Design a protein around this ligand. Structure first.
Ligand SMILES: OC1CCN(Cc2ccsc2)CC1
Ligand SMILES: OC1CCN(Cc2ccsc2)CC1
Length: 460
């Protein structure tokens, strides 16, 4: 049985509105309804991994797992295995995988983050799961962010607290937050960003929705505008939205949006919005293709409609050579040459790098760079040709060209990371000096850039 080089991943997000689901929810897992939908001819083909995020979930873990497994069994005739389930309050993540994947999946981690302080601590936050699938790390975050049209900044703060504090993936990657720990990271949930138009325009918005004319509404979607202004979700992707707003419906139909202020809403309007979203971030030059992104039309127990997204994701095999794991392969080397970091910091400490990668036996710490002033105010940290030659565990090009080097630039004075980034080894050539580049972030915000040249030697 050959190991796969591609899998498909189902991501679902549904704010259940504290109500039990209807007896049939198969449309969700089939990516049928509105938007970018899945071909009927694929209905019996199981996805490799199903990741289900709920919010306002009233069910027990046992009750929901029985509904999910039954649903998938009815669709596919496959009995899925439970990889992980984690619940914080009424926020839940379930990961299911085809039984043939059970021995391919390892290093399963779960965690949660509670957002807010005192008043604002008690029902919003995130749950997450990570694991290895053969040689590929996968992370999944289901977040229920702060509600209300006038709280986009709070949502952005919730996002930063979740990516800082959610402890998933390899703990040895200590300078790196979840936005750098995984080959593929999927972030989804009731992100609660709204269509930011005047209250008076509610009926106009509803009209536009009935005409399937989303352009003048998406131009006011807070998640798209905040992302465009680099306020949130920097370096994440989202498929184009081609489905109607998923919130806020009258229950038991989808014919009516319930937007008017009520005591039950705290006297807030809920103009129709795309609250329910799926975003991703994959390491550079890894295959990831969105094959569906839409909402169901026939599941009406909640004031939200379920959202689905599906992905092709590249994966690699668990490589063994005669040498590594457990020694270096002297036929392999990575040289980072004429490299410099451009930092936005106004500090004047010395800086060093750390190189982290599962292609190394352990992380590598450089000597200090030489600080210079840029012409527009910036700190430039020069490394010249002083960086350590990296000795990968396996030199085979079919392994090494699929790997990535995480880079942290750290203060000599404090050992704290000022910036994190990632470089692909999927080069156009080996034994050749080639340009490399990564932005650097810290707490998911842009803090600088790293650029220079790489020279990769493989056994070919
Ligand atoms: O693909 C990436 C670069 C191009 N964009 C930037 C953008 C446009 C609206 S929101 C964020 C999407 C992410
Ligand atoms: O000749 C002096 C300046 C250059 N260094 C090397 C260097 C370059 C970037 S970081 C360290 C050696 C001494």
């Amino acid at each position: 049985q050959p190991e796969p080089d591609m899998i498909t991943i189902f991501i679902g997000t549904w704010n259940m509105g504290n109500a039990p689901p209807p007896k049939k929810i198969t449309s969700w897992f089939l990516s049928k309804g509105q938007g970018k939908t899945r071909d009927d001819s694929a209905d019996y083909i199981p996805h490799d991994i199903y990741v289900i995020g709920t919010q306002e979930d009233p069910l027990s873990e046992k009750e929901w797992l029985e509904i999910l497994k039954h649903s998938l069994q009815e669709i596919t005739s496959v009995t899925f295995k439970t990889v992980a389930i984690h619940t914080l309050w009424n926020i839940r993540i379930v990961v299911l995988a085809k039984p043939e994947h059970e021995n391919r999946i390892s290093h399963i981690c779960t965690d949660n983050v509670k957002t807010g302080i005192a008043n604002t601590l008690g029902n919003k936050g995130a749950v997450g799961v990570s694991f290895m699938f053969n040689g590929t790390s996968l992370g999944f975050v289901n977040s229920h962010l702060t509600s209300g049209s006038e709280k986009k900044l709070r949502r952005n703060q919730n996002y930063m607290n979740i990516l800082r504090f959610l402890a998933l993936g390899d703990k040895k990657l200590s300078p790196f937050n979840i936005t750098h720990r995984f080959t593929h990271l999927f972030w989804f949930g009731d992100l609660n960003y709204r269509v930011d138009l005047p209250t008076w325009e509610a009926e106009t918005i509803i009209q536009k929705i009935k005409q399937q004319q989303y352009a003048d509404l998406l131009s006011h979607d807070q998640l798209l505008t905040e992302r465009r202004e680099q306020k949130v979700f920097l370096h994440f992707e989202e498929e184009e939205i081609t489905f109607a707003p998923t919130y806020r419906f009258e229950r038991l139909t989808r014919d009516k949006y319930a937007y008017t202020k009520q005591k039950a809403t705290g006297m807030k309007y809920n103009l129709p919005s795309w609250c329910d979203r799926v975003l991703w971030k994959s390491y550079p030059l890894v295959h990831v293709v969105c094959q569906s992104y839409g909402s169901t039309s026939d599941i009406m127990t909640s004031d939200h409609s379920p959202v689905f997204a599906t992905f092709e994701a590249g994966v690699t095999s668990q490589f063994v050579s005669k040498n590594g794991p457990g020694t270096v392969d002297s036929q392999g080397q990575i040289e980072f040459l004429r490299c410099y970091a451009t930092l936005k910091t106004k500090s004047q400490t010395k800086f060093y790098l750390e190189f982290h990668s599962s292609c190394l036996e352990s992380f590598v710490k450089s000597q200090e760079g030489e600080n210079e002033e840029g012409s527009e105010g910036e700190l430039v940290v020069k490394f010249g040709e002083t960086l350590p030659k990296l000795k990968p565990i396996i030199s085979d090009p079919e392994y090494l060209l699929d790997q990535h080097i995480l880079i942290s630039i750290k203060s000599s004075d404090s050992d704290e990371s000022y910036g994190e980034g990632c470089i692909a080894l999927r080069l156009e050539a080996t034994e050749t000096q080639l340009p490399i580049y990564t932005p650097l972030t810290h707490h998911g915000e842009l803090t600088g850039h790293f650029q220079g040249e790489i020279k990769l030697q493989t056994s070919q």
